[PDB]
Amino acid sequence: MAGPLSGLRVVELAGIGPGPHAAMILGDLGADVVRIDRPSSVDGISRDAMLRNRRIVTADLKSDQGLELALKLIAKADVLIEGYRPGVTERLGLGPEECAKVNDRLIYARMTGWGQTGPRSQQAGHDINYISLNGILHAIGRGDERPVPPLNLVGDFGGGSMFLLVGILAALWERQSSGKGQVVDAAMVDGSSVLIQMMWAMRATGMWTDTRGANMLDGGAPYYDTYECADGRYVAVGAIEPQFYAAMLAGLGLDAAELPPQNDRARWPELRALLTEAFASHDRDHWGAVFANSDACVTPVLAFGEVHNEPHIIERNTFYEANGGWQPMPAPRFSRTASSQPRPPAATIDIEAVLTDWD
Amino acid sequence: MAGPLSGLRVVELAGIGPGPHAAMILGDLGADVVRIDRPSSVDGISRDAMLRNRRIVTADLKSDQGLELALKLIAKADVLIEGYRPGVTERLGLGPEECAKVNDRLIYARMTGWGQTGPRSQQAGHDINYISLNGILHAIGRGDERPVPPLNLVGDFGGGSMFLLVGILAALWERQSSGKGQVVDAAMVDGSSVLIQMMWAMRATGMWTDTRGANMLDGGAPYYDTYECADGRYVAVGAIEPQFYAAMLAGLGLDAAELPPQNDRARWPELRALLTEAFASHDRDHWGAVFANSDACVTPVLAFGEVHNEPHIIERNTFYEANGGWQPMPAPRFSRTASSQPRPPAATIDIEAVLTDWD
Ligand SMILES: CCCCCCCC[C@H](C)C(=O)SCCNC(=O)CCNC(=O)[C@H](O)C(C)(C)COP(=O)(O)OP(=O)(O)OC[C@@H]1O[C@@H](n2cnc3c(N)ncnc32)[C@H](O)[C@@H]1OP(=O)(O)O
Ligand SMILES: CCCCCCCC[C@H](C)C(=O)SCCNC(=O)CCNC(=O)[C@H](O)C(C)(C)COP(=O)(O)OP(=O)(O)OC[C@@H]1O[C@@H](n2cnc3c(N)ncnc32)[C@H](O)[C@@H]1OP(=O)(O)O
């Protein structure tokens, strides 16, 4: 099995969102990932590419046989991932304390939104709820309109699965000293707050306000935003540094002497109107050409469907093809122990066959 | 130093955005992190709270002495982080190969937007550019308007710093069984693509379109969006599962029989109009109360400055007071080897002092 996490063994209690995303990535990087799902719900080989790099098994954990098979897998494994509400694995017989008795080397990884304790810890929720409570959602969107969710990128993945991964892997490094595992408490409300640490930093020093759409990186700055082109498609402009901004102006045909200063915020309305008219005068692909190989920080805003035609995406093999859709190749990349193409979802496997293989 | 990464040694070549964020999290979890900045820019004690849990040193990497000193640090370290454009560390003579001469164990971590090679590899960029090329930016915002950047959470951090971290820690695991370091190539355009794997999976199975504002999780669904309240503040609604959706309807005062189906997408506009009027009839805190302890998936949308006053936030200590204001405490959390509160940014110490300390 290719990749730097070769040999690493993982048990995943099937759930939704961050849990499986973390499990995917471990698998992506070479880990041996085994996923226990309900029989209650499996109808052949899965169509969810998020379940790649997996062996799937079925098991009613409510039954006593279920429980004990599961407990055998765990005993032979380096990591457990579960993302149910607090108390669920306890009441199944699969809690940290019950796991610590069949394998004190276990990394016990708990993926929630709200955390393991406190008033909201039993409330159902999704991405949008967790980022609503810690200031993030309020900051996203135009100023004249209600906040807009950044899909489920910030709570589920950036501030969720990825902090679960850091926790698992940080704990594996600890386990090299002490010889013992431990419990990783990954909550989306905490992870996403560390994910946005920069704004908390800038806020402290007066470089960020609570007003939506009036900051350097939220769309309020005319040099960090998208612009509609002549064809109704878009470019992105990220020309923060004055040298890059100058390069942008020259490619737009605008003379700096006729525009307000880049960072004169009181004249951002004028500046925006000027840039808006210039970008509107040609189509996205024109600007893409004009600015390729420049430091102007102007790129075309591509739709998912067009990504596979972009030279730089093609050439670094950022995507692979599989079942009527492209999918991302593993990230990041390793010089010596490279990951390989992900193995698709495979039909289910008997939990015995796995206990055998793991010997 | 408290945390699972006690006695990991990390050398950070100073940059902006992802590299410092990764370095911060490593520090947060108890790593020994030394940041080499240029003397050109160090004036006082640094007021960027992202520079917490660091020792700062200066060193002209272009002088002979600066280079030699840096290479002695790197020889005594486990991980090196650099976030310059490709070729830059090579020309300083701090490239992977020079580092492997003084330390075949080093994890060499390279943080870029576009990657190490390919047509855009030398192009300046920021977050908004990286996410423009791979379909992410196009998918965020309302459908009747131009895309809106989700701050710099998705390229710099979620698809950026966090993938650098998963790369550093997976390589440390691989090292324990091979004796050898390697090079981690973390490109924001790759990481952010994996971060958004759920949408690629969903588009593959016909459950996501390239139309902005027309999807389950992009704000197009009336049960997954924000709503403005009587006071001009907002709630977030995330009631995907029908039973959570039904609980929300009951709390709004809405008889399910008069509404269109939850998931009849052709009637979503009509459904949104009915929910809009309901939510508009009371203020945000009213709904926060009504739905406390509920599975309705309804939460108040808090601005940064309100977050310190929310019970679930206080009681889990997600933030600590510092500096000007609040900062996120480390994430995720560890049962046995727990992180401690971050140390505020050092004063510049001398690179020899560090060297004698590390001997
Ligand atoms: C249309 C559906 C698909 C929606 C797709 C959405 C994906 C993305 C979206 C934007 C997110 O943001 S995804 C993150 C949600 N939050 C969390 O994941 C954080 C923490 N977990 C939760 O809050 C809950 O899991 C959640 C609200 C997601 C679901 O609640 P639930 O349905 O009440 O499940 P809960 O976790 O409380 O417990 C269910 C358990 O099922 C039983 N048992 C598990 N595995 C097995 C098995 N193999 N065999 C038998 N039973 C199994 C447990 O016994 C338990 O049931 P019980 O409490 O009734 O005893
Ligand atoms: C917080 C404060 C303000 C932050 C403003 C924005 C914050 C967030 C924003 C939204 C982002 O998205 S941040 C991510 C940007 N992209 C990358 O980080 C991707 C990779 N790097 C780049 O593409 C470039 O670094 C970038 C475009 C960011 C800037 O280009 P550059 O200024 O030309 O720098 P480059 O990397 O090309 O090389 C600069 C180097 O400086 C010299 N030397 C470094 N350390 C030292 C030293 N200790 N002593 C002396 N000189 C030093 C290097 O020699 C090199 O210079 P050279 O090629 O002129 O020889």
Residue numbers in the entry:
A (entry chain A), B (entry chain B): 1 to 359
Show the paper's wording:
α-Methylacyl-CoA racemase from Mycobacterium tuberculosis (MCR) has been explored as a model to understand the AMACR racemization mechanism and as a drug target. The catalytically active enzyme is a homodimer (with an apparent molecular weight of 83.6 or 89 kDa) with the active site at the interface between the two subunits with catalytic bases contributed by both subunits. Each MCR homodimer contains two active sites formed by residues from the large domain of one subunit and the small domain of the other. Key catalytic residues from the large domain include Asp156 (helix 6) and His126 (helix 5), while Glu241 (beginning of helix 9) is contributed by the small domain.
The 2-methyldecanoyl-CoA 6 side-chain group is a straight-chain group and electron density covered C8, C7, C6 but no density was observed (except in active site H) for the terminal carbons C5, C4, C3, C2, C1 due to conformational heterogeneity (bottom right). Clear electron density for the thioester carbonyl and Cα-Me groups in the ibuprofenoyl-CoA 1 and S-2-methyldecanoyl-CoA 6 complexes shows a cis conformation. The thioester oxygen forms hydrogen bonds with Asp127, Asp156, and His126. In 2-methylacyl-CoA structures, Fo–Fc maps did not favor R- or S-epimers; both were refined with full occupancy. The Cα-H of each epimer points toward His126 or Asp156, resulting in distinct rotations around the Cα atom. The crystal structures for ibuprofenoyl-CoA 1, other 2-APA-CoA substrates 2-5, and 2-methyldecanoyl-CoA 6 demonstrate that this mechanism applies to all these substrates. We therefore performed a similar analysis for ibuprofenoyl-CoA 1 and analogs, and 2-methyldecanoyl-CoA 6. This analysis showed that potency was negatively correlated with LogP for these compounds, that is potency was decreased with increasing LogP values.
